Design a protein around this ligand. Structure first.
Ligand SMILES: COc1ccccc1NC(=O)N1CCC[C@H](C(N)=O)C1
Ligand SMILES: [Zn+2]
Length: 138
């Protein structure tokens, strides 16, 4: 679990969005596993606008943060799950690091701000949905 709170927006994994997220929908994209909903309170986070390929992510299954080197946002095949058929997920960044399914929503940050959230993983890999291209979040 986890979310980004920026301005009057909440950014979550689309597959973990709540009934309230869908009732206050701003934008969603199944191919990116992202959903953005509107909030009444002002958010605590700021978004990176950069080309960093290193950063630190929060891993809830270890209660710890880990440093990572990650690939540039790309189209990656993701196997079927209970949430989606087998498909290509876009704007995904992969890295070597521990993750389990419930780690989705953990934030990846570089020195500039929030880069994205955990969205995929397996066998010593962790994948992050990029948010740096969503300029309207600002
Ligand atoms: C962090 O996720 C994992 C880690 C280790 C093992 C498995 C996972 N599950 C995982 O990759 N997905 C399940 C939920 C929806 C995901 C998606 N974006 O399509 C895919
Ligand atoms: Zn950066």
């Amino acid at each position: 679990s986890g979310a980004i709170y920026v301005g009057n927006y909440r950014v979550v994994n689309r597959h973990l969005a709540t009934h309230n997220d869908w009732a206050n929908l701003v934008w969603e994209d199944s191919s990116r596993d992202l959903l953005v909903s509107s909030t009444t309170a002002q958010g605590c986070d700021t978004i990176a606008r950069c080309d960093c390929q290193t950063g630190v992510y929060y891993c809830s299954s270890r209660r710890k943060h880990y440093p990572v080197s990650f690939s540039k946002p790309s189209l990656i095949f993701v196997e079927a799950s209970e949430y989606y058929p087998a498909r290509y997920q876009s704007h995904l960044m992969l890295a070597v690091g521990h993750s389990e399914p419930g780690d989705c929503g953990g934030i990846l940050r570089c020195q500039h701000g929030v880069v994205g959230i955990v969205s995929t993983g397996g066998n010593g890999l962790v994948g992050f949905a990029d948010v740096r291209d969503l300029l309207w979040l600002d």
